[PDB]
Amino acid sequence: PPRVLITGGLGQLGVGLANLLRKRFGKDNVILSDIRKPPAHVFHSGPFVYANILDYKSLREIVVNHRISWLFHYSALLSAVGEANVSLARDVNITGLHNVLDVAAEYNVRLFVPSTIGAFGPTSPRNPAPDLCIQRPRTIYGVSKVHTELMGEYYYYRYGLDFRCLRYPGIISADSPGGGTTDYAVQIFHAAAKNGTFECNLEAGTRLPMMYISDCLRATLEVMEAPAERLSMRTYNISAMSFTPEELAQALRKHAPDFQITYCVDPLRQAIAESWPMILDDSNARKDWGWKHDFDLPELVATMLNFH
Amino acid sequence: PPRVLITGGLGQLGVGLANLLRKRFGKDNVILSDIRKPPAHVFHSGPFVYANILDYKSLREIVVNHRISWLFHYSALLSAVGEANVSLARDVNITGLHNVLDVAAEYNVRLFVPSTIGAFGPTSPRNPAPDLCIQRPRTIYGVSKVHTELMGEYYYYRYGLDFRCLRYPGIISADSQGGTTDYAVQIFHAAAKNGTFECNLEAGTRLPMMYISDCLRATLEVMEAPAERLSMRTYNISAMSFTPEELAQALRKHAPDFQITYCVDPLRQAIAESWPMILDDSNARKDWGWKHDFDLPELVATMLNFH
Numbered sequence A: 001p002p003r004v005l006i007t008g009g010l011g012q013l014g015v016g017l018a019n020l021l022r023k024r025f026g027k028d029n030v031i032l033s034d035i036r037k038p039p040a041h042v043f044h045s046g047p048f049v050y051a052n053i054l055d056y057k058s059l060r061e062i063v064v065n066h067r068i069s070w071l072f073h074y075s076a077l078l079s080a081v082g083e084a085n086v087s088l089a090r091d092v093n094i095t096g097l098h099n100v101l102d103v104a105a106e107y108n109v110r111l112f113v114p115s116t117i118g119a120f121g122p123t124s125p126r127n128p129a130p131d132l133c134i135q136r137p138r139t140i141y142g143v144s145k146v147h148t149e150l151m152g153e154y155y156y157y158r159y160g161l162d163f164r165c166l167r168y169p170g171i172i173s174a175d176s177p178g179g180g181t182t183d184y185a186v187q188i189f190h191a192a193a194k195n196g197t198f199e200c201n202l203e204a205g206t207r208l209p210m211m212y213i214s215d216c217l218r219a220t221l222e223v224m225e226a227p228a229e230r231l232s233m234r235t236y237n238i239s240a241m242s243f244t245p246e247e248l249a250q251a252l253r254k255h256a257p258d259f260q261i262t263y264c265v266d267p268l269r270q271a272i273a274e275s276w277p278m279i280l281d282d283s284n285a286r287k288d289w290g291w292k293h294d295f296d297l298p299e300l301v302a303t304m305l306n307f308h
Numbered sequence B: 001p002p003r004v005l006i007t008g009g010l011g012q013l014g015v016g017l018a019n020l021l022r023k024r025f026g027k028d029n030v031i032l033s034d035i036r037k038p039p040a041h042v043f044h045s046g047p048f049v050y051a052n053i054l055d056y057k058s059l060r061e062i063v064v065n066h067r068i069s070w071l072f073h074y075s076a077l078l079s080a081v082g083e084a085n086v087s088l089a090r091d092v093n094i095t096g097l098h099n100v101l102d103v104a105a106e107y108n109v110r111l112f113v114p115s116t117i118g119a120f121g122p123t124s125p126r127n128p129a130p131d132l133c134i135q136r137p138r139t140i141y142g143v144s145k146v147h148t149e150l151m152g153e154y155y156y157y158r159y160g161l162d163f164r165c166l167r168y169p170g171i172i173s174a175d176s177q178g179g180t181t182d183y184a185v186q187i188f189h190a191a192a193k194n195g196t197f198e199c200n201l202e203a204g205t206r207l208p209m210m211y212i213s214d215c216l217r218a219t220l221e222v223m224e225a226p227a228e229r230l231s232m233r234t235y236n237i238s239a240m241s242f243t244p245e246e247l248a249q250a251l252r253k254h255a256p257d258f259q260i261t262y263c264v265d266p267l268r269q270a271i272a273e274s275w276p277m278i279l280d281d282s283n284a285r286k287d288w289g290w291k292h293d294f295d296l297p298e299l300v301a302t303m304l305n306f307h
């Protein structure tokens, strides 16, 4: 049975991942870690430990002391704050990656690091985006994730490092601080129950790949539990659905016909939305290991409304 | 009349580049720098300065004090030595790049960093390799050179960083002191002193190659090129491509009693198969008017003169 450390696990996805993994391995075999102070409920969910990813010395301690064998590298600065703070995002994303790589390599850890729809550029295929294609993002966040894919794979060929990487689409979850380019699709459900009116910051027909949190984490666990031999590559696209604000607004209106939508586009967020793909092609992920999504637009909307 | 700094310029290319740039912009306007001790003759060529690329604070000094406006970033650990020392090669090639980037952006410096045929992998187009394609190199040096491309271009779209980049083929020069493309240099030093060279690559293994003069000239010309005539910031630079057997063929036009014994080192062979065979330089020729001068015939003639 494996001992798990989750790096930067107090963000949008981390807590959910902790819950899924603790159910699979036991409360005490999953160690949650971040640099921020944890909410009372999450601290009492199981072991939590302060971990600064830029501090390499501290990662060795934690991995040795807690006999960690599985690591999920969730700590990063995303496309939102990344652009405003290029120096720090470079540090946390690239130097942080190296440290996690080194520790896992030295101590025989199976390593998960997410990549993103932001790892693609304007010169990339967008309808759909395959697993192997031109990657030339013009965001520090994406560039660093391209680096994550390449470095991770190299460490698998140079050393026997068990590196596994899923390119997450925009993830939708119930109670998620703001964002964030794909953030409208989280906030919309808040305003749907609050007033019945929501101001959207992307164009009505901006198609992006999306996914419910349950699917995202289920994929994450599955690929990690997968037999090595069935993995022809180490970075996979993961896919569930693609939609637009307009298409989401209809699915909402199926339950709440009164729901009203307005628009005020943010050019900054709109510009990087246009640079991303519209659909993710996960042929390889479905073929190699048994990837199937459980949530599409109707059921995603149903569950999200069930939290209000 | 720009003030130039050549980083890590005691290797194969930096000295020749110093010579070219000094004849163009002035002896005292081009500073050569490295961490190693410079030979006597090169020390007296023009201004030389110790500069460790890992030392960010020292780069800030040098750039401000010597009022640098043009930087050519040659410091690296190459494909062969990098696989031996991954942690070191990661520092020098990655944090070294990061430092060079931060300095060039802050002080409004024209930055040149060369990429390589090594920036491609087994999943890439190989015959010929275009400017835009899949890049999945399976060497640390390769992974850091892709990172070089993306970071440099990002800083161009993010800040106002004038980042200009060329992907060199394996460069050939007479004055060269154990890489992958090394065979094409060690051959002449064993060709004039007749007449059998042991090659460590298979008879029909094509790689893009170029003579130092063309490499250095393109490097200058791309920097001299007007910014608005540049549709991209990373260009393939091409001249010729050959196999070991083809190289032995053109040597016979000058010395017919030449012979090759192929004893192939699989480690360098494998990564030679992971590299492209030809580089397409359409964009280079189109945008800033690139044209090579040395093809296989006149490459051999020039090299033999040095023996």
Ligand SMILES: NC(=O)c1ccc[n+]([C@@H]2O[C@H](COP(=O)([O-])OP(=O)(O)OC[C@H]3O[C@@H](n4cnc5c(N)ncnc54)[C@H](O)[C@@H]3O)[C@@H](O)[C@H]2O)c1
Pocket: A007, A008, A009, A010, A011, A012, A013, A014, A033, A034, A035, A036, A051, A052, A053, A054, A073, A074, A075, A076, A077, A078, A092, A096, A114, A115, A116, A117, A167, A168, A169, A170, A171, A172
């Ligand atoms: N959420 C999505 O929709 C989505 C989409 C694509 C990819 N991803 C990827 O999934 C991973 C996790 O996603 P997320 O949305 O939960 O991120 P998030 O922004 O919600 O949380 C990131 C966490 O990293 C932590 N962190 C920052 N600097 C740190 C340091 N030096 N040491 C330790 N921790 C540090 C932050 O405190 C934060 O809790 C990221 O790598 C992200 O790129 C997420």
Ligand SMILES: NC(=O)c1ccc[n+]([C@@H]2O[C@H](COP(=O)([O-])OP(=O)(O)OC[C@H]3O[C@@H](n4cnc5c(N)ncnc54)[C@H](O)[C@@H]3O)[C@@H](O)[C@H]2O)c1
Pocket: B007, B008, B009, B010, B011, B012, B013, B014, B034, B035, B036, B051, B052, B053, B054, B073, B074, B075, B076, B077, B078, B092, B096, B114, B115, B116, B117, B167, B168, B169, B170, B171, B172, B181
């Ligand atoms: N020559 C080729 O075949 C070729 C082909 C493609 C690309 N390139 C690129 O061209 C550039 C120059 O290549 P080269 O043939 O001179 O390589 P080289 O190995 O001969 O020279 C590298 C130089 O950088 C110096 N250096 C190493 N670490 C340093 C540090 N921390 N601080 C300062 N200096 C340091 C070394 O002392 C050495 O003199 C490199 O960026 C290389 O990636 C070369």
